[PDB]
Amino acid sequence: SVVSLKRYELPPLPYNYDALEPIISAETLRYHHDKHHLGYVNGANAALDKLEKYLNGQLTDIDVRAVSRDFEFNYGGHILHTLYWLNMAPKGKGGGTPGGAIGDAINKFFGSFDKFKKLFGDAAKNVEGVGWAILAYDPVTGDLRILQVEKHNNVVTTNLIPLLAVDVFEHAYYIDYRNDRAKYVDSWWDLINWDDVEARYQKALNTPKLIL
Amino acid sequence: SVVSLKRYELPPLPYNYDALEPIISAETLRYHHDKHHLGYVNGANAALDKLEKYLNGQLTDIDVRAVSRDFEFNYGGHILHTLYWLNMAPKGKGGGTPGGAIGDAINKFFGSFDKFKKLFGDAAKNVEGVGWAILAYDPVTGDLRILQVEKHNNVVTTNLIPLLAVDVFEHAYYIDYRNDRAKYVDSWWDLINWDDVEARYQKALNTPKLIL
Amino acid sequence: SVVSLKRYELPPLPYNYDALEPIISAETLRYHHDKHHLGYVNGANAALDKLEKYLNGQLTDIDVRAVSRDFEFNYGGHILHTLYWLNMAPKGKGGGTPGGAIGDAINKFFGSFDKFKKLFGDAAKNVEGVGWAILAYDPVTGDLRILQVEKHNNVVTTNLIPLLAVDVFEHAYYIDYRNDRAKYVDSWWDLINWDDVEARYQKALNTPKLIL
Amino acid sequence: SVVSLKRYELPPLPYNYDALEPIISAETLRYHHDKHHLGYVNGANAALDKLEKYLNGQLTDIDVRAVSRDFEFNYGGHILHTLYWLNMAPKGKGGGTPGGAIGDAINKFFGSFDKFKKLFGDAAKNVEGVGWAILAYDPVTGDLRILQVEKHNNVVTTNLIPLLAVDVFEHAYYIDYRNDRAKYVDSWWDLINWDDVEARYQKALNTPKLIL
Ligand SMILES: [Fe+3]
Ligand SMILES: [Fe+3]
Ligand SMILES: [Fe+3]
Ligand SMILES: [Fe+3]
């Protein structure tokens, strides 16, 4: 009868704010996490608020298209930032090349880590506008696929399971790199928590085929 | 070393081609499934072909943005059509209102089946341009969420698990309804295989939280 | 003080409804012009209504993003359909290859009419999803440019002056060609009112450089 | 016979690089103009290069969709930045409220400068992702319309004549305002060269109705 939608919370950074120095600044982490990521969480919740109010009869009409777009963009922002932080680890700890199933999967689907790294780097550097590059697991095939995302919710589609994501909205790098997205993406390699990615990939491998 | 990407296949319709009459014509099913859906499968595979050729060194350069966009749009087309067919059942068998966990989940998150039906119908009817309305499971919250999708890969974002989808590209209805998307979406309710949706929702409920 | 925004009208078809047979059906013209084009006009006006009501204080708040998107999509729909109809002429009268400044301009910028026709046809056939191909005049350079448009208001940008446009939303062709957009675009060549295009191009040539 | 497409040039800033201090930094102007704007010019030209090479037979096949998208995004970037710079004037000289036909037009279509300023500010602040807010002249009606643009070439459509544009890609403000787009847009008001806008609006008023 009465709808109470579960709202979104800003997850804590998985490390302290200078953990990614000198590749990503504490300052970038503060803006990026506590302001931009927070904004997407809040934007997602604000859609949910409109929906709820409509469904519980406090709002008479709702612009379902606008609320959908709002929800989806901001939820995309939330989930992708959440992934993004998880995918990184202190400059010491993360980085280097993946081992385990993920490393093997990358070799299988891109030939080598270096060929993957190159194509993935280029996918990130060549997001037109702002967005993301994502290494995803395709449940249909079991193949890894590189995706781009523009904004948080254009170009990307469903069912693909993102394992690793790099944000190339300018705010991810502008404080530290200004316009030099390329030099950001290049260095971001050294922050990758490949265990995190591995663990996600293991989970992905064991998700039931939902559609096909 | 040598990449061999797993290509996509056009799944068989889950019923004969006049199974959805008089709501959706055999003719629509023939065009929609065997031509449009096929085209997305083929378009997805053609991206994979470019990627492979690039990665195995037959193509020197690849436009990673273009191949990404191509892959994602067409894969979206494939997966969403695949869902779409599965979500329907002969005019006899499917339709009516959901029971089981899904029916309860709809009541919980939209108040009633009728409030959901109204909002979902409006989400479909008010896709701007062409796209989809999707009833999805949000693994983060356990909430159902209504999404829109424009094309197969705009507005939508990742992580959300689509349970039920209605295509509102014009080709889904134009043969049978011409411009009257609304009358199509209204009738499409009578084709819903709610067991299919239930089964997907059960699977969704038991997918490990991938991100958050 | 009191805002009264000028609303949009559906312009009359520039020929009777069977004027484009057998390439485009009267039936297609009826749906396409009197329903789809009308819908964009109405959608554009409905945005204007929200804006006005907001600005004159009848609506307290407005979702400026949503109204902007609404206005722009539908205005795009209106203006592009308006162009589209004007660009065609009875199967007898229109068609063939352009002479005058436009024909020369096409030769200059694409090498030959056949090279232009091929690339323009391919641009139309390869709109991903629905949209338009447009032959535009670039005031900055004086060059013709081929554009795509997705929906009526994605991919395209401002300042470019559209001269000739072909709609490849499915509704432009589905009644007559079903999924065979290609065969539609191929035949649409025979409807082009090249004088209309010429006249527009003359006007374009004599528009003051607005920006650059 | 042989196509030689006219490429794009980066126009000079219409003032020295610290002319907009303290609202927009010299540093922002250097990155924004000499790197980001330059990048769009170059990206536009690189599309033109592919087109030319294809048309003159040096490239066998072209991905017309990809080149179209590339051209349109970057040309949008070029033309909109070009407008953006022109629309600003040293903190001394520009700013305040418009007089002349433009000031009257704003009063006519938004009620008052303050109502316009509020709605326009909100349109800029509420671009989802990155893009632009634009005050445009609608040749069809003679009405001013506020547009949003996402990236340089989404949401916007043709025929509308942009008079005034504010960039809300993060790079327009991030150096000076970090995430505080709102405080940027608010201050940007003080840089508006309203004479520039007036002059453009005069030109717009005297452009022949191209379509309708
Ligand atoms: Fe970000
Ligand atoms: Fe479809
Ligand atoms: Fe149309
Ligand atoms: Fe910019």
Side-chain angles (χ1 to χ4, degrees), chain A residues 32 81 167 169 171:
Chain A
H32 199 173
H81 282 84
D167 191 3
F169 276 65
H171 65 245

Side-chain angles (χ1 to χ4, degrees), chain A residues 168-179 181 184:
Chain A
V168 297
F169 276 65
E170 285 167 338
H171 65 245
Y173 56 81
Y174 221 76
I175 292 158
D176 303 323
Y177 298 91
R178 296 287 190 272
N179 71 302
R181 182 189 284 183
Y184 158 76

Side-chain angles (χ1 to χ4, degrees), chain B residues 32 36-37 40 81 84-85 132 152 167 169 171-172:
Chain B
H32 199 173
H36 291 288
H37 183 170
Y40 308 125
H81 282 84
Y84 180 65
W85 313 125
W132 299 80
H152 308 310
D167 191 3
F169 276 65
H171 65 245

Side-chain angles (χ1 to χ4, degrees), chain D residues 32 36 40 81 132 152 167 169 171-172:
Chain D
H32 199 173
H36 291 288
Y40 308 125
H81 282 84
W132 299 80
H152 308 310
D167 191 3
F169 276 65
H171 65 245

Side-chain angles (χ1 to χ4, degrees), chain C residues 8 72 75 138 148 153 155, chain D residues 8 72 75 138 148 153 155:
Chain C
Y8 299 96
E72 287 172 65
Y75 176 91
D138 172 19
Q148 291 187 322
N153 64 329
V155 190
Chain D
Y8 299 96
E72 287 172 65
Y75 176 91
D138 172 19
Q148 291 187 322
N153 64 329
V155 190

Side-chain angles (χ1 to χ4, degrees), chain B residues 117-137:
Chain B
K117 174 177 173 157
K118 168 70 179 144
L119 180 58
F120 191 78
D122 286 353
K125 286 163 199 192
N126 289 287
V127 165
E128 182 174 75
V130 296
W132 299 80
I134 288 172
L135 178 56
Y137 174 69

Side-chain angles (χ1 to χ4, degrees), chain C residues 6 8 55 65 69 72 75 115 126 128 138 143 145 148 150 152-153 155 157 200 210, chain D residues 6 8 55 65 69 72 75 79 115 126 128 138 143 145 148 150 152-153 155 157 200 210:
Chain C
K6 173 68 161 168
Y8 299 96
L55 286 164
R65 175 161 63 230
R69 285 173 168 173
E72 287 172 65
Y75 176 91
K115 286 162 178 258
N126 289 287
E128 182 174 75
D138 172 19
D143 279 16
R145 295 289 183 237
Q148 291 187 322
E150 287 174 24
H152 308 310
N153 64 329
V155 190
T157 190
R200 190 156 303 93
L210 276 149
Chain D
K6 173 68 161 168
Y8 299 96
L55 286 164
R65 175 161 63 230
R69 285 173 168 173
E72 287 172 65
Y75 176 91
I79 67 191
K115 286 162 178 258
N126 289 287
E128 182 174 75
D138 172 19
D143 279 16
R145 295 289 183 237
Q148 291 187 322
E150 287 174 24
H152 308 310
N153 64 329
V155 190
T157 190
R200 190 156 303 93
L210 276 149

Side-chain angles (χ1 to χ4, degrees), chain A residues 6 8 55 65 69 72 75 79 115 126 128 138 143 145 148 150 152-153 155 157 200 210, chain B residues 6 8 55 65 69 72 75 115 126 128 138 143 145 148 150 152-153 155 157 200 210:
Chain A
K6 173 68 161 168
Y8 299 96
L55 286 164
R65 175 161 63 230
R69 285 173 168 173
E72 287 172 65
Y75 176 91
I79 67 191
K115 286 162 178 258
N126 289 287
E128 182 174 75
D138 172 19
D143 279 16
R145 295 289 183 237
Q148 291 187 322
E150 287 174 24
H152 308 310
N153 64 329
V155 190
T157 190
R200 190 156 303 93
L210 276 149
Chain B
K6 173 68 161 168
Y8 299 96
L55 286 164
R65 175 161 63 230
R69 285 173 168 173
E72 287 172 65
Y75 176 91
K115 286 162 178 258
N126 289 287
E128 182 174 75
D138 172 19
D143 279 16
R145 295 289 183 237
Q148 291 187 322
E150 287 174 24
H152 308 310
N153 64 329
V155 190
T157 190
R200 190 156 303 93
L210 276 149

